[PDB]
Symmetry: D3
Subunit: 64 residues, 6 copies
């Protein structure tokens, strides 16, 4: 089982390692697949490239 | 944060619900993102459509 | 420019044709790319395979 | 409904904001989904990483 | 190295096995990656779900 | 037919051109699709962003 993860830019390397570790464990427990077979990779998206209801994460970050 | 999951066909609905639940929890804990923002969806791939080292999961399933 | 669209199962064929038409027009107008170059394809996801905040679209559809 | 957009590097930020805005509107009109649910994100591909009929956008950009 | 392949519905199983075999060999030769590490999977898209310049493969299939 | 390729960062430009060329040829031969229709694009993943059995390519690169 494979997981393709999409996150915004700006997260710590510790958080990205945890994404790999916890998502891999999550797939192992949910499907009982051998960890050897599990692959997880992470796309880091610029805030200008991430739209929520038609507004970019960048424009939202300017607000409270 | 979003997770696009690829699994082979043939898993129970309980396993697929667990994929959604555990991967969502994994992303929440790894990034501290609000669960409201997290999305996880699952592509179920036919065994004929899944290649490992040039051999399909289907041809492998014939073997021990 | 290419668009990979993810929607839930259960939409009319007219809505899917409109997705192809309107997304193609949207990319043409936003980037001025020739329509000849634009490609849009649609993955229809089972409601059991679509997680929102850890809950599947299927379990949500049972509710009001 | 979600849209994963693939464009070549080198487009203005105004064009990328327009991609987010117009694709979101396109999905809203085609499916009648609430804008709150719609997500659009953009991968910007290096010209060396984009093949058309076996030739990269980079090699093509050298030509007329 | 991983390859995610998108083809229209309607191809023979022999063609899909060849996709897995030849794409795997192509990645092995281009990158010198061990075949053990290479993964290739195939999404088969309904013709109604595949847009070329704003027109679906289905509407095109009606024409000559 | 389209191929979305995922490789680790750090490969030569010659290898990436070969990916585009050989994968395009592989799809042409496997499906008999006209080369004009074939598209191949390449995501280069940071080693920190690529998990194998729960361990990142980066941590593995430290080892023998």
């Amino acid at each position: 089982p494979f997981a393709q993860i999409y996150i915004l830019e700006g997260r710590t390397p510790e958080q990205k390692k945890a994404v790999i570790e916890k998502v891999t464990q999550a797939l192992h427990e949910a499907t009982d697949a051998k960890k050897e077979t599990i692959r997880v990779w992470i796309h880091e998206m610029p805030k200008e490239n991430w739209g929520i209801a038609g507004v970019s994460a960048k424009d939202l970050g300017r607000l409270e």
